[PDB]
């Protein structure tokens, strides 16, 4: 295309140079205008861009006729070649490229079923304002391009959230998002599907692919059916003791409902006990103030000091509540016989061990 | 699985549609993610059969038409016309 | 006219140093490299105030260039007599120190050596050193400082003035447009007022810088009055290249203009209440028949 | 003359090298003080 453009430019300039310097044959060549060839090239460039300074122009009749034909032909050729220009420009991929690592800033790779609801809830809890200052970026890897509402949602959090188009099952796309340097991979499930077993198998295969690329990465996955998570025990790289976790939606939800059946309001307490809720000061004597006093609590894990060793759990709990203003719920009892097990409020017979 | 001693020694053959999934069939593989199909351990050990090799056979049939007949008489068990 | 000295200083500073870097490539520092990197890092508050300072001083240098454009292209002045020249070289040596900090923290020497800030420093600072050495001032390529306007939007990101992404993109596009407009006007001003070197500089056309800005605006809109135009050969050649480059850049940036215009929602907004006129809200299955 | 021409050729590059050396020295000194 460039060669054709330059060639026609130069030959048109040559025609103009010849006709202007020669002069009109029927007027005894008295119409000659002293134009250099480069001035004719300049004139053609000014004309074809539709600028038209008029500093240099064609004065001969045949030169003006040639200029008219060149204008018409140039417009026709440009109109004909517009589609090839559009093709050469093309449609650039908006969500291509690769994630650029920033020193001192960890990133979390999120994959699976990426739609409005799941991303909205996860970003609402994860990027909450009351969260302590954490320098973590979120990279959503998904083959399906986002719609307008998802694009707007990503624009609202453009400084901390990036989206890339690709598949987890393709190792090249895993290399693009720097999965070998990610802190964790979070797999979201499609809670509204015709076949939950197919979604569970797809999530398990995504886990298999991720652990095949990098066996030391930490994975948190969502599982729909409870009988499928046993498949996660078949992966050799799946280490539960190192932080790999499967959250079973049906099991947890139905267990919450059953525990609320045993004692109503427990689901609300648990949901408020691990969620980041902003605190609002209420001065009017309403139920909202007493509720909001209790919303602010959270769960924490801590190693007991050596001063509590050899003491019963009720005694240690009483000392923590009365003096340390802390409510101790459970202890992780570790034994060489049966590994480690969480005991919820053990009796006075149990004694606190070391660590 | 486990028996009374483990299922890793059981000889199995797995039909595969996509070649890139073959590295998922092996646990203790040091193969890089860009390793081609014929260099992976599951393919080299014969524990995985990728159907895409049949797509190769067509080309092998074009340059020599006796190869398909030899394969058919060696593989199908002697199916006479 | 010793313009070739000022030009060749920048030419050797760029080319010969690039060549020796490639030659060395063919043939405790990590600590200082990381120190410089964290010093000039965007997240560091020192980096924020330093980039704001260098942007402001670039604006000041551009203003000084605008003031000095009225003066002849090649004149003579004294360091001790003129305070403005001392201010200009203080600005330039500050840019020199910033270039040093950027170079010592550069991960790759070649890519840092082939970027816009490095080349504008190369074509700006050795000229003022030669000017103060020989006590002769040449207008040179100081208008290239206008390229710093391209980072203007980033400054507004550090001061929290701009929050949405669309505003940042719009400000970036406008900054690029204004910067290229001003630097093209500077090139035209220099080439037209200097004259053709091979004709003993007898082709000089007395054009102010603002007239060159007006000429560039008339040209890029494809109006072409012809009241003011380029008469020198090199000026006309630059005009041809600027027309081609402007058309190419506009064609490349059309999709971003379409994105910024976007597709407006036709049935958005809210109902505006009118006093004395009740309204009925109809919802449900809204099709043609019902 | 050629001496002044040599000065106007080398004044730029020499000043750049001086700037780089000064930056390197300042960084080395501050790093040494930080390690202290
Ligand atoms: K809470």
For residue C89, how many C-alpha atoms fall within 13 Å in the half-sphere facing its CB? Answer: 18
For chain D, say whether C112 makes contact (Cβ under 8 Å).
Answer: no
Using DSSP bridges, classify how beta strands B14-16 and A339-344 pair: parallel, antiparallel or unpaired. Answer: unpaired
- Long-range contacts formed by C255-263: CB under 8 A, 24+ apart: C255/A89, C255/A92, C256/C169, C256/C173, C260/C166, C260/C169, C260/C170, C260/C173
Experimental method: cryo-EM
Q: How close is the nearest chain A Cα to the Cα of B24, in Å?
A: 7
Q: Do C100 and D13 touch (CB under 8 A)?
A: no
C271 forms beta bridges with none
CB A160 within 8 A of CB A138: yes
Q: How far apart are CA C203 and CA A287, in angstroms?
A: 88
Q: What are phi and psi of A329, to 5 degrees?
A: -95, -55
The sign of the dihedral angle between the CA atoms of C237, C240, C241, C242 is: positive
CB A162 within 8 A of CB A114: no
CB burial of residue D30 (10 Å; 0-12, 13-18, 19+): middle
The chains in contact with chain C, meaning 3 or more Cβ pairs closer than 8 Å, are: A, D
Phi-psi region of A83 (alpha: psi -120 to 50; beta: other; left: phi over 0): alpha
Tokens matching residue A8: 């026609």
Residues making up the annotated binding site of A are 137, 160, 162
CB C172 within 8 A of CB C162: no
For chain C, say whether D25 makes contact (Cβ under 8 Å).
Answer: no
Q: What are phi and psi of C205, to 5 degrees?
A: -120, 120
- The resolution in angstroms reads 2.8
Task: Kindly identify which residue of chain B lies nearest to residue A171, measuring between CA atoms.
Answer: B33
- Chain C residues near residue D31 by CB distance under 8 angstroms: 31-32, 35
A141 forms beta bridges with A164
Ion ligand 1 nearby residues (CB, 5 A): A 277
Which residue has tokens 């208008």? C143
Tokens matching residue C63: 């203003």
Query: What share of residues in chain D are helix, strand, coil (percent, to 5)?
Result: 90, 0, 10
Q: How far apart are CA A304 and CA A341, in angstroms?
A: 16
Tokens matching residue C188: 């035209």
Contact between chain D and chain A (3 or more Cβ pairs less than 8 Å apart): no
Measured in whole angstroms, the distance separating CA B41 from the mean position of its chain's CA atoms is: 11
A335 forms beta bridges with A339
Using DSSP bridges, classify how beta strands C74-76 and B48-50 pair: parallel, antiparallel or unpaired. Answer: unpaired
Q: How far apart are CA C33 and CA C39, in angstroms?
A: 10
| A170, A174, A212: residue with CB nearest B24 | A212
Largest CA distance in chain B: 53
* DSSP string computed for A309-353: TT-BHHHHHHHHHHTS-----EEEEEETTTEEEEEES--TT-B--
Q: What are phi and psi of A107, to 5 degrees?
A: -140, 150
Q: Do D19 and C96 touch (CB under 8 A)?
A: yes
Tokens matching residue A90: 């093309």
Ligand 1 geometric centre to CA of A127 (Å): 15
CB A210 within 8 A of CB A179: yes
Q: How far apart are CA A90 and CA A97, in angstroms?
A: 17
Which residues does A258 contact at the CB level (< 8 Å), separation at least 6? none
Closest CA to C227 of C240, C208, C214, C236: C214
Tokens matching residue A139: 């990279």
Q: Do C133 and D13 touch (CB under 8 A)?
A: no
- Chain D residues near residue C104 by CB distance under 8 angstroms: 20, 23-24, 27
Give, for A223, the enclosing helix (H) or strand (E).
strand A218-223
CB A105 within 8 A of CB A136: yes
Task: Kindly identify which residue of chain D lies nearest to residue C3, measuring between CA atoms.
Answer: D8
CB C58 within 8 A of CB C124: no
Give the CA angle between residues D14, D20, D25 to the nearest 5°: 125
Alpha helix stretches (DSSP H) within A132-286 = 148-156, 171-176, 196-213, 249-262, 266-273
Give, for C64, the enclosing helix (H) or strand (E).
helix C45-68
Q: Do C222 and A38 touch (CB under 8 A)?
A: no
For chain C, say whether A9 makes contact (Cβ under 8 Å).
Answer: no
| C31, C97, C130: residue with CB nearest D19 | C97
Beta strands in chain C (DSSP E): 74-76, 136-138
- Chain C residues near residue D34 by CB distance under 8 angstroms: 35
First to last CA, chain D: 52
Q: How far apart are CA C55 and CA C41, in angstroms?
A: 16
Contact between chain C and chain B (3 or more Cβ pairs less than 8 Å apart): no
Closest CA to A256 of A264, A267, A247: A267
First to last CA, chain A: 76
Distances, alpha carbon C96 to alpha carbons C21, C100, C119, D19, D22, in Å: 19, 6, 12, 7, 11
First to last CA, chain C: 86
Q: How far apart are CA C149 and CA C69, in angstroms?
A: 19
* DSSP collapsed to 3 states, chain B: CECCCEHHHCCCCEEECCHHHHHHHCCCCCCCCCCCHHHCHHHHCCCEEECHHHHHHHHHHHHCCHHHHHHHHHHCCCCCC
Tokens matching residue C89: 């070289």
Q: Do C224 and A46 touch (CB under 8 A)?
A: yes
Which residue has tokens 């030669």? C130
For chain B, say whether A213 makes contact (Cβ under 8 Å).
Answer: yes
Q: Do B34 and A209 touch (CB under 8 A)?
A: no
- Chain C residues near residue A158 by CB distance under 8 angstroms: 165
For chain B, say whether A208 makes contact (Cβ under 8 Å).
Answer: yes
Give the CA angle between residues B30, B36, B40 to the nearest 5°: 40
The sign of the dihedral angle between the CA atoms of C138, C139, C140, C146 is: positive
Q: Do B33 and A236 touch (CB under 8 A)?
A: no
- Chain B residues near residue A175 by CB distance under 8 angstroms: 33
First to last CA, chain B: 45
CB A190 within 8 A of CB A199: yes
Phi-psi region of A24 (alpha: psi -120 to 50; beta: other; left: phi over 0): beta
For chain C, say whether A49 makes contact (Cβ under 8 Å).
Answer: yes
Quote the DSSP letter at residue C206.
Answer: -
- Chain A residues near residue B24 by CB distance under 8 angstroms: 205, 208-209, 212
B40 forms beta bridges with none
Q: How far apart are CA A204 and CA A169, in angstroms?
A: 11
For residue B51, how many C-alpha atoms fall within 13 Å in the half-sphere facing its CB? Answer: 5
Q: How far apart are CA A222 and CA A203, in angstroms?
A: 8
Closest CA to A294 of A330, A317, A327: A327
Task: Kindly identify which residue of chain C lies nearest to residue D9, measuring between CA atoms.
Answer: C9
- Chain A residues near residue B32 by CB distance under 8 angstroms: none
DSSP SS3 for C205: coil
| A41, A51, A54: residue with CB nearest C243 | A51
Alpha helix stretches (DSSP H) within A102-156 = 116-126, 148-156
Tokens matching residue C247: 């058309």
Largest CA distance in chain A: 128
The sign of the dihedral angle between the CA atoms of C186, C192, C194, C197 is: positive
Tokens matching residue A338: 């049966």
Q: How close is the nearest chain A Cα to the Cα of B32, in Å?
A: 8
């Amino acid at each position: 295309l460039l060669s054709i453009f330059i060639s026609t430019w130069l030959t048109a300039a040559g025609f103009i140079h010849l006709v202007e310097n020669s002069g009109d044959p029927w007027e005894n060549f008295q119409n000659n205008q002293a134009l250099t060839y480069w001035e004719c090239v300049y004139l053609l460039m000014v004309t074809m861009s539709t600028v038209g300074y008029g500093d240099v122009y064609a004065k001969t009749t045949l030169g003006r006729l040639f200029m008219v034909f060149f204008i018409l032909g140039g417009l026709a050729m440009f109109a004909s070649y517009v589609p090839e220009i559009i093709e050469l420009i093309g449609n650039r991929k908006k969500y291509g490229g690769s994630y650029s690592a920033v020193s001192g800033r960890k990133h979390i790779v999120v994959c699976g079923h990426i739609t409005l609801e799941s991303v909205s809830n996860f970003l609402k809890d994860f990027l909450h304002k009351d969260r302590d200052d954490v320098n973590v970026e979120i990279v959503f890897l998904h083959n399906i391009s986002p719609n307008l509402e998802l694009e707007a949602l990503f624009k609202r959090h453009f400084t901390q959230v990036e989206f890339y188009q690709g598949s987890v099952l393709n190792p090249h796309d895993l290399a693009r998002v720097k999965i070998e340097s990610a802190d964790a991979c979070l797999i979201l499930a499609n809670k509204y599907c015709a076949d939950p077993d197919a979604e569970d198998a797809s999530n398990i295969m995504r886990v298999i692919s991720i652990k095949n690329y990098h066996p030391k990465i930490r994975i948190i996955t969502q599982m729909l059916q409870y009988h499928n998570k046993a498949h996660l025990l078949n992966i050799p790289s799946w280490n539960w003791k190192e932080g790999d976790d499967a959250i079973c939606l049906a099991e947890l939800k139905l267990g919450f409902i059953a525990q609320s059946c045993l004692a109503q309001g427990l689901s609300t307490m648990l949901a408020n006990l691990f969620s980041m809720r902003s605190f609002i000061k209420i001065e009017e004597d309403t139920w909202q103030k007493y509720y909001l006093e209790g919303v602010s609590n959270e769960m924490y894990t801590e190693y007991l000091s050596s001063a509590f060793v050899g003491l019963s759990f009720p005694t240690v709990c009483e000392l923590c509540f009365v003096k340390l203003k802390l409510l101790m719920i459970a202890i992780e009892y570790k034994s060489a016989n049966r590994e480690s097990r969480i005991l919820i409020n053990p009796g006075n017979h149990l004694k606190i061990q070391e660590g | 699985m486990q028996f009374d001693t483990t299922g890793v020694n059981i000889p199995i053959i797995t039909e595969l549609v996509n070649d890139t999934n073959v590295q998922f069939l092996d646990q203790d593989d040091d193969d890089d993610p860009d390793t081609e199909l014929y260099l992976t351990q599951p393919f080299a050990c014969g524990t995985a059969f990728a159907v895409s090799v049949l797509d190769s056979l067509m080309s092998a049939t074009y340059f020599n038409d006796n190869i398909l007949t030899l394969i058919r008489t060696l593989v199908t068990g002697g199916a006479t016309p | 006219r010793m313009w070739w000295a000022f030009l060749a200083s920048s030419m050797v500073t760029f080319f010969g140093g690039l060549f020796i870097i490639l030659l060395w490539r063919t043939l405790w520092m990590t600590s200082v490299k990381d120190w410089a990197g964290v010093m000039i890092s965007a997240q560091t508050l020192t980096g924020r105030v330093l980039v704001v300072l260098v942007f402001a001083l670039s604006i000041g240098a551009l203003v000084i260039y605008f003031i000095d454009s009225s003066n002849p292209i090649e004149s003579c002045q004294n360091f001790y007599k003129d305070f403005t020249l001392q201010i200009d070289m203080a600005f330039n040596v500050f840019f020199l120190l910033y270039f040093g900090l950027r170079f010592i923290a550069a991960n790759d020497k070649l890519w840092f050596w082939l970027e816009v800030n490095s080349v504008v420093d190369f074509f700006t600072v050795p000229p003022v050193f030669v000017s103060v050495y020989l006590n002769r001032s040449w207008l040179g390529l100081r208008f290239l400082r206008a390229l710093r306007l391209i980072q203007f939007s980033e400054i507004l990101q550090f001061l929290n003035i701009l929050k949405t992404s669309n505003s940042i993109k719009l400000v970036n596009l406008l900054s690029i447009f204004i910067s290229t407009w001003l630097t093209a006007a500077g090139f035209i001003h220099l080439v037209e007022n200097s004259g053709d070197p091979w004709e003993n500089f007898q082709n000089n056309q007395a054009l102010t810088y603002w007239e060159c800005v007006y000429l560039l605006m008339v040209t890029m809109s494809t109006v072409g009055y012809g009241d003011v135009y380029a008469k020198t050969t090199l000026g006309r050649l630059f005009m041809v290249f600027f027309i081609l480059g402007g058309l190419a850049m506009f064609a490349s940036y059309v999709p971003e203009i379409i994105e910024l215009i976007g597709n407006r929602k036709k049935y958005g907004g809210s109902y505006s209440a009118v006093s004395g006129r009740k309204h009925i809200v109809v919802c449900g299955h809204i099709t043609l028949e019902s | 003359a050629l001496r002044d021409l040599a000065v106007v050729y080398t004044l730029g590059p020499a000043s750049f090298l001086v700037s780089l050396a000064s930056c390197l020295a300042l960084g080395s000194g501050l790093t040494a003080c930080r390690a202290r």
